[PDB]
Amino acid sequence: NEDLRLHLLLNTSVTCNDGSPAGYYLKESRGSRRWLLFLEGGWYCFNRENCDSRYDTMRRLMSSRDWPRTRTGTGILSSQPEENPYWWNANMVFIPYCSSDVWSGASSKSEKNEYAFMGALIIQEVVRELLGRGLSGAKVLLLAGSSAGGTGVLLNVDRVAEQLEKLGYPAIQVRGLADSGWFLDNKQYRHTDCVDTITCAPTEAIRRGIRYWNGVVPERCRRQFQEGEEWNCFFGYKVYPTLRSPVFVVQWLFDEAQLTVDNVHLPVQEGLRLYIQNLGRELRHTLKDVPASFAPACLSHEIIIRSHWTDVQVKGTSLPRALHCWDRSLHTPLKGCPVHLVDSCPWPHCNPSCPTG
Ligand SMILES: *[C@@H]1O[C@H](CO)[C@@H](O)[C@H](O)[C@H]1NC(C)=O
Ligand SMILES: CC(=O)N1CCc2c(Cl)cccc21
């Protein structure tokens, strides 16, 4: 099945990196008042040289020129209850990542800009155009995303809520689901020079990116960290407490992209074992006061749009179940329906349900 249909943005000034129109894939579920808007991930680029390389060999992440007319909804975007016990009947939206800016940018391609970085405006424009296609009647809009799209949720969920309020739709409950986008600005295991994208330490690329992208962060977080320090707001544990919308955080304790930016590459000796154990403990610590969270002790990357996302469990509860319990909690804890699920065991795959690879 190829069930989500491409719609390029009617406002063609809201563009991918190369000036081609951004867009969204939609599958409507008439009668459902639930809308799931999913932000794709795929790293970022923070200067002309690394963006030029990404344009040569990762062009779908920078341009809509070659996008297919349809996509299959998978995982949380699947309409089959077997694959998606959580929200199989919802209206499904997949928003391709083609701005390379962690969904933060608001800069057009101009005389002085080779590329447009418009991720924040792409989300706003998708929401606006969807309102005429049924979103006006929604009761819940869940803004979800994986990896850079998960960080995109944290950066944009409150702006979507504010946008709908200002447009006159106060009854739409905006919520966030951030998958694999909760990173730590920690020390690398072995230091690298910030010359490329994947090996550059987390707190550095984002600083350059904000300037290059004209990147924007949530207002309360911006007011805490102030000018020149907005990069702090890309880190879940710092931006999350400033957010008003309900946000459910999904995060592997040993996320492969976290390990990559930390220059960890997997017989593990003492120093690396200690480093990995400390990373899991730090991640666990940052989630202690996040009431809706699912954080399994696995070495892996993303979860929610994978077809077998149903398989992982923490403390006997799957992610689709935890998300359903979260829905119920937003109607004091619920009997047999937990929403805070963080593994405590200290090593990758100490949870037997971890993805096998
Ligand atoms: C198109 O989107 C851009 C970017 O947000 C905005 O400046 C402009 O007002 C929009 N125009 C229309 C007609 O929606
Ligand atoms: C893979 C990816 O997308 N990464 C890794 C590090 C990071 C940060 Cl620190 C913010 C937003 C995205 C990403």
Q: 31: exposed, middle or buried (C-beta count within 10 Å: 0-12, 13-18, 19+)?
A: exposed
Query: Distance between CA 165 and CA 167 in Å, rounded?
Result: 5
Question: 235: closest CA among 245, 244, 225, 227?
Answer: 225
Q: What is the C-alpha R_g of the chain?
A: 19
Experimental method for this entry?
X-ray
Query: Distance between CA 277 and CA 272 in Å, rounded?
Result: 8
Query: Distance between CA 280 and CA 354 in Å, rounded?
Result: 15
3-state DSSP call for residue 96?
coil
Query: Distance between CA 48 and CA 33 in Å, rounded?
Result: 42
Which residues have C-beta atoms less than 6 Å from ligand 2? Answer: 41, 43, 102, 147-148, 151, 183, 202, 234, 257, 261
Element spanning 317, H or E: strand 317-318
Q: From the alpha carbon of 124, which atom of ligand 1 is closest?
A: 5
Question: 49's torsion region: left (phi>0), alpha (psi -120 to 50) or beta?
Answer: alpha
**Which residues does a chain break follow in the chain (C to N more than 2.5 Å)?**
266, 331
Query: Distance between CA 78 and CA 6 in Å, rounded?
Result: 16
| Sequence-distant contacts of 72-76: CB under 8 A, at least 24 apart | 72/1, 72/2, 72/3, 72/4, 73/3, 73/4, 73/27, 74/305, 74/306, 74/307, 75/303, 75/304, 75/305, 75/306, 75/307, 75/309, 76/36, 76/38, 76/144, 76/177, 76/304, 76/305, 76/309, 76/320
Least distant ligand from the CA of 239:
2
Q: What is the DSSP letter of 124?
A: H
Query: Distance between CA 154 and CA 340 in Å, rounded?
Result: 18
The alpha carbon of 96 and the centre of ligand 1 are apart by a number of angstroms equal to 19
Which residues have C-beta atoms less than 6 Å from ligand 1? Answer: 11, 13-14, 121, 125
What are the Cα distances from residue 216, in Å, to 121, 212, 229? 10, 11, 12
Provide the H-helix boundaries in the chain: 48-57, 119-131, 148-167, 202-213, 219-225, 236-239, 256-261, 270-287, 319-329
Indicate the top mutation candidate among 9, 12, 13 to test ligand 1's pocket, ranked by most ligand atoms within 8 A of CB: 13
Indicate the top mutation candidate among 14, 118, 159 to test ligand 1's pocket, ranked by most ligand atoms within 8 A of CB: 14
Least distant ligand from the CA of 120:
1
Query: Distance between CA 147 and CA 313 in Å, rounded?
Result: 20
Q: What is the DSSP letter of 266?
A: -
